[PDB]
Design goal:
This protein has three helices and twelve strands, in the order βββαββββββααβββ. By secondary structure, the chain is mainly beta. Strand 6 and strand 7 form a beta hairpin. The structure holds ligand KUI. It is found in: Nucleus.
Length: 206
């Protein structure tokens, strides 16, 4: 694996952003986190992140046991919290086979599920490949609220302390055959002021 994606499904873009209200006058947007995928990746042993994701039911541990392991990834984000209009999230996946996807996103706090978002995306055949777009989806209110509180902290190390207990688990399944296609675990730190968002993608091995 050389990127976030498998033989059956590749992540092309993900971004979490805000467009200030004056973007209508002159467009701009702030990216909190961003992955653009328009030598193999480093690996991380899954035991090292087991605590950040509750055992619970159908958690990282359970899903990873069912497999296949080449479908499991860890993304480390350095979020850019240096920026009040539209808060949005955009995702795009690609595949060679025609499928209907169910994308489940679970937000955890202190290894306890807080909110869950589930959506179904159908394929658009474009240039011999199938594309799945969910663009400009409104960011869930819990995380818009979280970002506002998070930016109020006076110290970067306090934001990292808070973000230590904050994880997202994203599961993409083939809706018709129910087989898992992709599972990404996301962990978070805050980027320093001058640096924008950054990420590091790893394969989850055990
Ligand atoms: C990481 C993968 O996320 C998703 O797949 C997804 C789906 N709905 N969704 C939101 O409705 C808000 C965020 C988000 C909001 C804020 C931040 C952060 F800036 F705090 F890091 C990160 C993700 N993320 C998501």
């Amino acid at each position: 694996a050389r990127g976030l994606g498998t033989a059956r499904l590749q992540l092309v873009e993900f971004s979490a952003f805000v467009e200030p209200p004056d973007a209508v006058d002159s467009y701009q947007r702030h990216l909190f986190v961003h992955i653009s995928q328009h030598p193999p990746l480093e690996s991380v042993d899954v035991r090292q992140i087991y605590d950040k994701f509750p055992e619970k039911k159908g958690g990282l541990r359970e899903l990873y046991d069912r497999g296949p392991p080449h479908a499991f990834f860890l993304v480390k984000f350095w979020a850019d919290l240096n920026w009040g209009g539209f808060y949005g999230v955009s995702s795009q996946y690609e595949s060679l086979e025609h499928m209907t996807l169910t994308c489940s996103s679970k937000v955890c706090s202190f290894g306890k599920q807080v909110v869950e978002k589930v959506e179904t995306e159908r394929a658009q055949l474009e240039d011999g490949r199938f594309v799945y777009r969910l663009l400009r989806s409104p960011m869930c209110e819990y995380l818009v609220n979280f970002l506002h509180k998070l930016r109020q902290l006076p110290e970067r190390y306090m934001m990292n302390s808070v973000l230590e207990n904050f994880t997202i688990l994203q599961v993409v399944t083939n809706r018709d055959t129910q087989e898992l296609l992709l599972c990404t675990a996301y962990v978070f730190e805050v980027s320093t002021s001058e640096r924008g968002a950054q990420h590091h993608i790893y394969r989850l091995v055990r």
